[PDB]
Structures are given as C-alpha cells and as structure tokens.
Amino acid sequence: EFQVLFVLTILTLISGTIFYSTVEGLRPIDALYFSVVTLTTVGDGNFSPQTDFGKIFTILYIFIGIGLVFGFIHKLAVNVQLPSILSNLVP
Amino acid sequence: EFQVLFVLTILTLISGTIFYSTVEGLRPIDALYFSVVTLTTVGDGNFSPQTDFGKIFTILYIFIGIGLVFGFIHKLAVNVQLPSILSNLVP
Amino acid sequence: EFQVLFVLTILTLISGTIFYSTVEGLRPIDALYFSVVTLTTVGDGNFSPQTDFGKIFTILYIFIGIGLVFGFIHKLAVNVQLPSILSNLVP
Amino acid sequence: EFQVLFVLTILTLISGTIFYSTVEGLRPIDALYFSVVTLTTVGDGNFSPQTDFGKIFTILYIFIGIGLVFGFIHKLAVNVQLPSILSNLVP
Ligand code: NA
Ligand code: NA
Ligand code: NA
Ligand code: NA
Ligand code: NA
Ligand code: NA
User: Fold this and answer.
1) What is the C-alpha separation between D62 and A39, in angstroms, rounded?
2) B60 touches A: beta carbon within 8 Å
3) Which residue among A19, B7, C44, D53 sits deepest, i.e. has the most Cβ atoms within 10 Å of its Cβ?
4) Please, are residues D39 and D62 in contact by the beta-carbon 8 Å criterion?
C-alpha cells in the first residue's frame, strides 16, 4: 500500500529531473528542485521553462503527477505520521 | 462521468489562453502555460498580469476554474490511474 | 449555507487589500491581486512583502484565510456548478 | 486534538526558520516567511535556495511538513472557525 506509492513518485520525480536538465540546460540538482516544487504546487519564483518544449512538458507533467505525488503525501501523513506521533502521546 | 470533466477543463484552459495572449500581449504558448499553472495553483515566478484588466480577470478565473480543474484531476487519478496501476500489481 | 461563505470570503479579501496598499505602498488593484493569489495558494512571482510588518501579516493571513477561502470554493463548485452543469446533461 | 497539532506545526516552522537563515544567509524574519509560504504551497516569487544544501533541504521539508501543516489548518478551520462563526448565526 505505502511501499507502492513510494516508488511511483520516485519514478515520477526522476522523470522530471531528466527532462529539465536536458531540454532546458539546468543542472541536475536544479531540475529536481523545479520538478518537486511543481508536483507539490509550491512553484519556483526565479525559473520558468524558456523553451516551447519545456512549456508543454510542464503542463502535461502537472496533470499526471499531482494526482499521485499528492496521493503519497496523503498516505505518508496517515500511515506513518498519524499513528507514530499519536501512539507517542501515551505516558 | 470522466469524459464530461475532460471537456469542461479544456474549454476552461482554452478560455484562459485566448485572454492573456490578447490583453497582455503574450505568445499563445505562454498564455496556456500561465493559465495552467494558475488553475492548478502552481503559479509562475516570472510573469504577473501587467494590465488592470488582466489582474481582475485572473482573480475571477481562479475562483471559477480551480473547482473543476481540480475536480478532473481527482477523477483522472481515481478512474484511470488507481485501477490501472492497481490491477497491474497482479503477477 | 452558500450565501454565508460568500460574505465571509469577501470580508477576508477586503481585509487583505486594505493592508497591502497601506503598509507596502501597493496600488489597491495590486493588493487585491496579491491577496487573492495567496489565500488560493497560487502566489505571485514578482512581488513579496518588503516590510517586516508585511511579512508577519502574510503568515497569519494565510493560516486564517485559506480555511474559509478554500471552504467557499468547495461550496461554490458543489452547490452551483455540479447540479447546474449536471442537470444540463439532459437532452 | 487541536492543541497537539498546534505545537507540531510550530516545531516544524521553527525548524525551517533556523535552517534558511544559517545555510542561505537570510535574515530570520525572511526565513520564517519562506518556510511558511512553502509548507502552505503558496511559494515565494523572489527567492529560491541558492545553495545545493538548501535545494535538497526544501524538497524533504515539503514532503514532511505539508502533511501536518495542512492537517492543522483542517482542524483550525473545523474546530474553531466552523462552530464559532456557525453558532454566531443565532439572532
Ligand atoms: Na494546493
Ligand atoms: Na503556488
Ligand atoms: Na508560486
Ligand atoms: Na526578477
Ligand atoms: Na498551491
Ligand atoms: Na522574479
């Protein structure tokens, strides 16, 4: 259940990082940052894709990735955080 | 169910793209990018509407579009992704 | 139900617009834009509060406003949009 | 219930503020602003981490903090706002 969504999102973040460092010429660490702030809908205030290929990629990358990247956070906050921090409140 | 929300959001993204390329003078591919990052609440870190008409349009475009654009992602992640990737885990 | 949340969010957006045009020196139409992109979590890619008073105001303005501003969109998309566009699909 | 999530998020915002003022060289009030706009997914349109350590920290800080920071807003809008403003509508 939780170990499946953990890999589905890693494959999704590794896909983004490979695309932006290649088409947009960004350093790998930067392309993983832009990819993460997008699927989480935080967004980057300094960089926006400057190629026609990047603009179209980001649009389709949002509608596909936000469903699962946000689907893992829901499982990562209710499977691991809730019970662990909850079962912690027993003195 | 899912084929209805697919067209409701396309009509909503085509509406945005036509407005920003005309009032703000943006190239069409850019206006579709700004329109997508808004309804998904990602946001663009380089461009903000520079006309009084664009500022008011974006405000009303957010409160109307975010309800359905996010209503399709919910259906696109539970109707197509969940069962397909789930039914995939059968060896 | 829906007419109550409609005024709760207007009072919340009118509060933001009055604060940023005064403390940050923004034109009123700009302060209403920055206030809307914040409570909806879209965010503005050109302006960030440049006064210590504005930085603290925005933080507390997010945790209080996002609960209701997003609580109206939920009602505005299920009370008015769902049944209207749904009852529309009857030929 | 609500007093537990109130401290879990303060510890989470105090963690962010200490990291960005130190690694990125930001003034404390600025690091608390960047930390708040991130966990709420608003995002800052002027600053993005400029060190390799900051870029990696922000990525892991998003996936851990957004689950609880958004889990408190849900409780802060349904435990305190709903009944208070609702019980207010009795003349
Ligand atoms: Na969001
Ligand atoms: Na954002
Ligand atoms: Na943003
Ligand atoms: Na700039
Ligand atoms: Na957002
Ligand atoms: Na900028």
Assistant:
1) 11
2) no
3) C44
4) yes
Contact D71, C61 (CB under 8 A): no
Q: What single letter denotes the amino acid at residue C31?
A: A
Contact yes or no for D90/D33 (Cβ under 8 A): no
Residue D85's H or E segment, with its range, is helix D82-86
d(CA B59, CA A42): 19
Q: Residues of D numbered 30-59 whose beta carbons fall under 8 angstroms of chain C's beta carbons: which are they? A: 30, 32-33, 36-37, 40-47
What are the domain boundaries of chain A? 1-91
| Residue range B1-91, CATH number | 1.10.287.70
Beta carbons within 10 angstroms of residue C27's beta carbon: 12
Residue C71 vs residues B80, C8, D6, D69: alpha-carbon distances, Å: 27, 10, 20, 17
Nearest to B5 by CA among B57, B63, B65: B65
Give the length of chain B: 91
Q: Is B42 helix (H, G, I), strand (E, B) or coil?
A: coil
Which residues on chain C are in Cβ contact (under 8 Å) with D75?
none
Residues with their C more than 2.5 Å from the N of the next written residue in chain D, i.e. before a break, are: none
Amino acid letter, residue D54 = G
Q: Is D71 on the interface with A (CB under 8 A)?
A: yes
* Proportion of chain B in helix, strand, coil states, percent, rounded to 5: 75, 0, 25
- To one decimal, the resolution in angstroms is 2.5
Chains sharing 3 or more CB pairs under 8 A with chain D: A, B, C
Instruction: Judge residue B40's burial from the number of C-beta atoms within 10 Å of its C-beta, 0-12 exposed, 13-18 middle, 19 or more buried.
Output: buried
Give yes or no for A80 touching D (CB within 8 A). no
d(CA C40, CA A16): 25
Chain A touched by D3 (CB under 8 Å): no
Helix spans in A24-88 (H): 28-39, 52-76, 82-86
For residues C34 and C47, is the Cβ–Cβ distance under 8 A? yes
Q: Please count the other Cβ atoms lying within 10 Å of the Cβ belonging to residue A28.
A: 12
